């Protein structure tokens, strides 16, 4: 139940709520007040999803789907079977995610580490909340949120995107994708670098960080370094999610036409709008 080095760290303290009341573990898992809160929220939500499955008449995981209120409901309540369960399952989800972050904070405090992890997690939560809470509220209806189903959530992404033409043309979307791709590029490189040093050619000694700087300078003429690369991956992946949330919070609210047409502002700038030749003249 414990890693070989673990016991020296399992001291009392760090909790945010309840003092010593929930200061304990179950196997490897820390509990705390927010472990209890997460369990409650998650269990309710799972129960409510299962109830929704009964009301839908299916126990197939690829068929179970929980849809938000229809647009006609606006921002008010809906009968359980017609959007109300979705509404409650969403409260539970939010409760579970935030509780999970806050339990992470308690773990940080016990372990004497920085709060970077739950801070990063909060971006994922905010992106979620953008899709199910902020955007629907700004657009005036819960029905704009995505449904909870494996395949039906994909129908919503497709339908939402095509509502605006080819969604590729959302400029915020473009920046988001750029961070996602750059992140995966950097993850591959960080992964490969450290391992190429720790696992050198057969029989050779482990290489040093000096060798890692050297390699990358040889290759591209720059090396960010060992602190920098962990700063970079954090930034790239959090930027990806930030611009994801941006690209959606602005769609159906400040811009709601075909995203391809937004780009016309550049083409119709007075000093070249009318010059013949090219694609747009």
């Amino acid at each position: 139940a414990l890693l070989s080095f673990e016991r020296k760290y399992r001291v009392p303290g760090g909790t945010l709520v309840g003092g010593n009341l929930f200061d304990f573990w179950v196997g490897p898992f820390y509990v705390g007040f927010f472990g209890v809160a997460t369990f409650f929220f998650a269990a309710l939500g799972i129960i409510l999803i299962a109830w929704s499955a009964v009301l839908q008449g299916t126990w197939n995981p690829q068929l179970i789907s929980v849809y938000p209120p229809a647009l006609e409901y606006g921002l008010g309540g809906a009968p359980l079977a017609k959007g109300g369960l979705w509404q409650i399952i969403t409260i539970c989800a939010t409760g579970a995610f935030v509780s999970w972050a806050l339990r992470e904070v308690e773990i940080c405090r016990k372990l004497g580490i920085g709060y970077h992890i739950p801070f990063a997690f909060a971006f994922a939560i905010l992106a979620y909340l953008t899709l199910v809470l902020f955007r629907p509220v700004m657009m005036g209806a819960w029905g704009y949120a995505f449904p909870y189903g494996i395949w039906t959530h994909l129908d919503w992404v497709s339908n939402t995107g095509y509502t605006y033409g080819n969604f590729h043309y959302n400029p915020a979307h473009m920046i988001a994708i750029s961070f996602f791709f750059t992140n995966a590029l950097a993850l591959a490189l960080h992964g490969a670098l450290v391992l190429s040093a720790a696992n050198p050619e057969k029989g050779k000694e482990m290489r040093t960080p000096d060798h890692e700087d050297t390699f990358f300078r040889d290759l591209v003429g720059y090396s960010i370094g060992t602190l920098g690369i962990h700063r970079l991956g954090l930034l790239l992946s959090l930027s990806a999610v930030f611009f994801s949330a941006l690209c959606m919070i602005i769609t159906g609210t400040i811009w709601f036409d075909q995203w391809v047409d937004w780009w016309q502002w550049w083409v119709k700038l007075p000093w070249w709008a009318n010059i013949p030749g090219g694609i747009n003249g």
Partner: peptide, 18 residues
């Protein structure tokens, strides 16, 4: 997964850079 994992790893290293 890459964004999840690099957010996790990057965050963790910074949290233990002390």
């Amino acid at each position: 997964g890459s964004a999840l994992l690099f957010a996790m790893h990057g965050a963790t290293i910074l949290a233990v850079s002390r």
